[PDB]
């Protein structure tokens with residue numbers, strides 16, 4: 017019970033009522049960063065969090081202004097502030113920086129939610145919390161504060177100096193955060209010894225994991241324009257060229273129904289499969305039956321465990337998200353859309369270069385479009401990019417985290433990679449020159465970016481205790 | 496000046512202030528039939544119209560209830576009432592039934608409108624009225640009442656017995672109206688001698704037309720379903736099959752970028768081009784430059800006048816409208832949609848059979864989908880169908896209408912067909928066994944189903960006077 021972790025573990029149980037309360041208030045402020053009309057909510061969310069920091073012991077609190085929303089439509093809307101804080105300033109202790117994000121994906125009841133997405137429903141009988149942002153990423157984020165509180169209530173010494181970096185643009189490209197970290201590497205973040213992030217999930221639903229790899233993400237829109245305004249599809253049908261028709265062809269040329277990306281040049285950039293990397297992949301626990309459970313269907317593209325895992329983790333993927341600018345409500349509308357935007361993204365792996373990938377994508381789309389012999393205008397542009405990240409899971413942090421997991425969940429965690437992405441992870445590693453650990457709180461069926469997003473209370477509590485032991489053990493590790 | 500048409504023409508000018516006023520109130524009630532939340536507005540619109548009928552001389556007014564919204568999502572919403580009325584009951588006069596529709600396409604400022612779509616802006620200096628529904632179809636509809644008023648104010652004898660049939664589901668499949676006409680053929684409509692419809696436009700912007708043909712319309716949705724809910728595109732990317740990916744392929748197989756429909760079986764049903772029909776096509780005035788003006792671009796599929804006309808009028812077309820169930824807002828969303836609906840319609844011509852076309856469409860979509868080797872579910876269904884219609888433009892009505900047009904616009908109208916559709920036109924002809932005339936009020940660049948829908952005041956006034964002379968001349972024709 018290192019400096020009595022049992023004391024801390026006990027307080028974590030006792031304080032569940034205030035933790036729940038804190039988490040309810042947070043979830044109720046709909047910090048949807050992608051929604052301009054809710055930007056003010058995003059600020060209230062940041063404000064609420066800074067208030068929790070301050071009520072707990074945190075100091076040197078800074079609501080950092082990245083500036084005005086820019087990049088590639090903004091009415092001079094300010095960006096959500098990045099929240100920096102410290103807890104403790106003992107020069108003999110290690111300093112751990114924790115990062116998370118307080119903005120959240122959009123959500124509406126009518127999307128199919130069983131409960132209202134921004135009313136956090138807590139069911140201690142089933143042991144689940146249902147609400148948008150509860151696993152991605154407001155639950156895990158607030159967990160760091162809960163943990164500070166538990167050390168406090170248990171009268172136990174906090175094992176490290178905590179430093180916080182909470183942004184509110186993660187669901188919207190993490191704009192400008194990149195620059196902040198680099199700018200502050202020899203400033204607010206000067207003394208950092210390590211970075212921990214809780215912003216992903218267990219592979220499955222039964223066994224905890226530690227994550228040593230993330231895919232990157234390149235998000236594209238293909239824009240096709242024709243007439244100057246929408247056209248009655250009857251008056252002009254068969255006589256003017258249709259952006260929607262070209263677009264089905266261009267979009268339909270990016271990837272097949274088996275998952276094979278059809279863009280020339282990508283496969284060449286994909287790092288080959290090594291025996292070293294192959295070692296780690298075995299002994300994982302996972303089956304397609306689990307994938308089917310999370311999916312809610314039998315629609316996997318692979319049956320072999322090795323295949324499912326490798327195609328989630330280390331082979332790229334291309335997904336097609338939807339069309340902007342056409343007719344998307346229910347029923348019928350007889351219209352020829354004037355200007356449409358096809359949405360699609362690529363999950364990047366080593367060793368894919370962002371730049372080259374974008375060129376390849378443009379080259380492919382331009383060429384396909386030109387082969388249509390269409391009078392329409394067309395071009396493909398990048399909306400946002402985020403780097404992939406791979407690390408060796410043997411350094412001090414993973415060891416500390418491994419013992420922590422073992423302590424709480426009674427088994428050693430699998431070592432896994434992630435299909436998902438956390439864009440700044442690489443920026444933390446390189447800019448600060450420290451190791452990064454990913455410590456998933458929730459399960460792989462939590463429904464992030466979907467309806468009925470849930471966090472199991474067992475993962476909530478288990479994850480907090482795991483965060484507590486991890487900080488404790490890390491503080492004890494010789495390096 | 497048949498029974499002083501000049502008197503009637505003069506009153507039509509003098510009464511422009513009340514006509515404008517009447518038209519403003521109507522346009523302000525947003526009878527968007529496709530929008531459940533606005534259904535109540537649709538009823539107010541019907542109510543408003545019945546009030547105008549009654550204030551003018553109309554009698555035997557009936558707000559006919561088609562029943563509860565049915566077919567292929569409805570919370571037992573009642574349908575908009577069909578409005579039947581008569582003006583005059585002289586047994587020695589001919590009876591003309593006029594049909595139009597008081598519901599309208601959806602509209603929002605943010606779609607790109609220069610003015611607020613449901614605030615009718617009337618600019619007598621430019622001579623335009625801007626508002627949703629002003630040409631399609633509320634302007635023309637109300638014109639019939641204006642005309643009754645003008646005869647009244649001019650103290651001139653109304654030349655026929657007018658009978659009205661105004662529905663509020665035209666933009667939503669004209670549900671149940673079909674049955675009403677057939678049911679009432681030997682009832683409310685027993686004495687009808689002729690049917691006139693003002694619900695389309697001049698071919699171009701310079702020369703009035705009379706319309707003797709309409710294309711039909713079959714509206715389809717292809718439904719592809721996979722997982723039970725949306726999936727994080729990163730967690731599941733490359734590993735589960737994507738409905739959106741299949742859908743781009745199925746949809747992208749329906750028609751090329753030249754306008755060629757790719758569904759087997761359709762061409763065979765297309766009636767061959769005759770010398771008779773070819774006669775009428777010549778002497779039309781139209782050029783691609785005009786098409787470009789209305790389009791706002793240079794994106795025609797044909798340069799030859801004959802080709803543009805024949806591909807608008809008598810060859811089928813396939814348009815692709817948009818996708819329901821995916822991501823359609825601006826920016827980026829990393830999601831794999833669970834269940835998507837691809838929207839597309841076919842403009843039918845003789846001699847395409849509705850039934851067979853639907854089979855061909857299903858056969859094609861099913862086969863394409865199956866060739867994808869996808870674990871997903873898929874099926875294609877018809878949302879609504881409306882018949883094509885072709886008539887000989889030489890009967891009493893067209894002659895009457897021709898002289899009327901000549902009188903007002905000083906030239907004889909071109910005889911044209913329509914790319915657009917008015918579903919019940921055939922039902923009127925067959926069920927009542929009379930001729931049908933289409934008397935376009937507006938121009939072909941009015942922007943129906945688009946942003947900034949306009950009606951030129953010259954067409955408004957010209958069309959009213961043309962409607963007046965047409966009723967007068969028809970009343971005089973020996974048959």
Ligand SMILES: [Zn+2]
Nearest residue numbers: 152187464465
């Ligand atoms: Zn997220």
Ligand SMILES: [Zn+2]
Nearest residue numbers: 152153215216
């Ligand atoms: Zn996340």
Ligand SMILES: [Zn+2]
Nearest residue numbers: 631666943944
């Ligand atoms: Zn319409």
Ligand SMILES: [Zn+2]
Nearest residue numbers: 631632694695
């Ligand atoms: Zn119409």
